[PDB]
Design a protein around this ligand. Structure first.
Ligand SMILES: O=P(O)(O)Oc1cccc2c1NCCC2
Length: 105
């Protein structure tokens, strides 16, 4: 159950996810997973980033779920579960702003 994962924040808004992540103590890749505000059946992975251009900022990626039972951000790289998707992105940045590092405090 995705609801038992400490990185799953359930039904919080995008603005609230930004408030939690825009903390100067958060290193790049600090993240959380929440329900999408407008897309029924999709989740959003919210991730903190940092560069000298923008400083501290937050990106949101849509995690799609297939009825066949697969989870993915890009259809070319799918996973059997949200847990496996999170594990994969903690090691590969691929197209994300940064690899996932720490669960949002
Ligand atoms: O849940 P939100 O606020 O991040 O709003 C969205 C609704 C649906 C999809 C997405 C949202 N924000 C941009 C990225 C994808």
């Amino acid at each position: 159950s995705i609801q038992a994962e400490e990185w799953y924040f359930g039904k919080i808004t995008r603005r609230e996810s930004e408030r939690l992540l825009l903390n100067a103590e958060n290193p790049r890749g600090t993240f959380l997973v929440r329900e999408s505000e407008t897309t029924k059946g999709a989740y959003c992975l919210s991730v903190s980033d940092f560069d000298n251009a923008k400083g501290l900022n937050v990106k949101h990626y849509k995690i799609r779920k297939l009825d066949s039972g697969g989870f993915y951000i890009t259809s070319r790289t799918q996973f059997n579960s949200l847990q496996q998707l999170v594990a994969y992105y903690s090691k590969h940045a691929d197209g994300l702003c940064h690899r996932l590092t720490t669960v949002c405090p």
